Amino acid sequence: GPASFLVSLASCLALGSGLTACRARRRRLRTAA
Amino acid sequence: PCDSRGQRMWWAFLASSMVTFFGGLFIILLWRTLKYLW
């Protein structure tokens, strides 16, 4: 139980961090364009 | 075959759920107390 919950939490946090990082550089690095 | 239940081991699922819930509560309370006690 707890191990699966921790795995799901870590996966969700990693996915959120990756999506935020991808969107951040997609937006700033192309502010002029 | 059939009739695969000779006895009951219902405690396993209940123990897993209870340990998950109570471990979450205990770790949250420990985090709160550690923040309180720096």
Automatic annotation (TrEMBL), chain B:
Membrane-crossing segments per the record: 9-31
Cellular compartments annotated: Cell membrane
Family: Belongs to the potassium channel family. Calcium-activated (TC 1.A.1.3) subfamily. KCa1.1/KCNMA1 sub-subfamily.
Protein known as: Calcium-activated potassium channel subunit alpha-1
Superkingdom of this protein's organism: Eukaryota
